[PDB]
Amino acid sequence: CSNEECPGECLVTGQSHFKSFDNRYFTFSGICQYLLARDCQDHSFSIVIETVQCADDRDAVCTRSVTVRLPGLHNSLVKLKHGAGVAMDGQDVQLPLLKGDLRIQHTVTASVRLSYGEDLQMDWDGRGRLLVKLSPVYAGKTCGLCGNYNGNQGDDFLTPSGLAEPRVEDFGNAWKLHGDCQDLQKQHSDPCALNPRMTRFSEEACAVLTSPTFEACHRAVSPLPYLRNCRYDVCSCSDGRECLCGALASYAAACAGRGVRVAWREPGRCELNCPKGQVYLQCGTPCNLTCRSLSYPDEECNEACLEGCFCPPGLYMDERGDCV
């Protein structure tokens, strides 16, 4: 085999669940603004996340919005609000948006896609879930909550001072932006030691991961870390109906990144339930199917599958939202 550095991804999801650039997983659950990642050697971009509490519970946390700053355009650019909308320097704008090197576009599966020159790709959909793909060019110049994008996962708790702490709370508190926000104490492990009623259901529900239905992907990504996250989410958040299926989809997407496919949607499970006139179909390769693409047929068509809502192969998307 021939070694070669390949693109890295920082992931934020769940109540408070992180995957650093290398492979490290953890949970922080702190309530303030934080710096997720920065160029740190050339100062080309910056990402800041705002955090709040949900589900009127001690251990339930969320992320409201993400703000990106690109010194290239000299201004504090788009802020990703809790809804699907975006605001450019305090003014709401309508997608898609084109500029010298920025492209913000609404995707098929009701999300947003922010892209800059040949790298720094961001996926964000409303309800606190962020994916950041970074090109290999930034291979060793990055400091933040995602950690340096090096090959070692053993030094992702590196504080700005220069030393690495053994505890997660101290590492997290080092990346605040306001002096008023308090520094949290010991991180609580089991959230439904406080809600004993929701114990049997959580354990019996977050067990499909270690079942034959996913056995194909059991040797593509180890489903140990995705099980405790499921248990934590079901135990903690206020609404277990959608929290359960907000976590399984994460594992399915992780598997899809390695090429493995799975259905994992059957009656009695959170089926997409697409509106009428559209199709829940699997891979459809969306580059056409929105007749904005019909107007511009020679811009680009290079995209993988998204198993989103689609239409029978005789229709294009209507502007108002129809597909007839």
Binding site: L35, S76, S161, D170, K176, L177
Partner: protein, 97 residues
């Protein structure tokens, strides 16, 4: 309380750093976001805030795990001794057993 200094906001595009951006020693290197200038007060640009009041930049203690450390103090971590200067830890490396 002197020698405290105040500042106003011209309110042209709200880029001035108001009271919302208090550059504490622990926050000096970190970028500061400005939702909008707010008429307030801040210590001189060459002076940075501390726990009680703003103090010389070169004296804010370096921070290891949840505790104070005055400048020039050294701490041994398993295999090497390291000392914090300019609030930043400096020390050699020795890959040991």
């Amino acid at each position: 309380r002197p020698p405290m200094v105040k500042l106003v906001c011209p309110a042209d595009n709200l880029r001035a750093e108001g009271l919302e951006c208090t550059k504490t020693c622990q926050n000096y290197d970190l970028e500061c976001m400005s939702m909008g200038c707010v008429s307030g007060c801040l210590c001189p640009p060459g002076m940075v805030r501390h726990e009680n009041r703003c103090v010389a930049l070169e004296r804010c203690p370096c921070f290891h795990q949840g505790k104070e450390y005055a400048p020039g103090e050294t701490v041994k971590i398993g295999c090497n001794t390291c000392v914090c200067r300019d609030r930043k830890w400096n020390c050699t490396d020795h890959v040991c057993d």
